[PDB]
Write a protein that binds this ligand. Sequence first.
Ligand SMILES: [Fe+2]
Length: 186
Amino acid sequence: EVLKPRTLADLIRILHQLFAGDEVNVEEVQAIMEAYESDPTEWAMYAKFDQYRYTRNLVDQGNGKFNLMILCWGEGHGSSIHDHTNSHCFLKMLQGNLKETLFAWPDKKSNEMVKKSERVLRENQCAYINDSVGLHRVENISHTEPAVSLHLYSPPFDTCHAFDQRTGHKNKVTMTFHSKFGIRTP
Ligand SMILES: [Fe+2]
């Protein structure tokens, strides 16, 4: 029932077709990303880790329609609470496991932020978020093993906001790439 890519290259090809138009079937993209069976022989060239924080590694620019990247989570690495600046955001597990915590948006007043959902993403699972869904934080569940995830953002974006869990106040953050196309960045 679901088109199953046999390789990461197949998946990218399919994604080029699915984002060529103006409409994006979210459930269709999600099912097809999920159907790809993570194969580290195919993506190890992108899996470039850092000791202290997670890294973002650009895989494909999707003809301007999306960014496809691989995120490498060291032992214990996690993100801040953040938004996704009005884009579609798909995240699929390639190795290990991430805990996703969804947060409600803050309003004007200062307040501890409210959790709306908490889950662990299973092997090969693809999750979806946008700003209407909520904010989230994601974290490697393991302090002894890495996690690796495949992210697709459409349209692409280079800035987002990080949120202080104690108050709801936010800061603009510029996103940076650790590598592009398997090549380390300055
Ligand atoms: Fe995110």
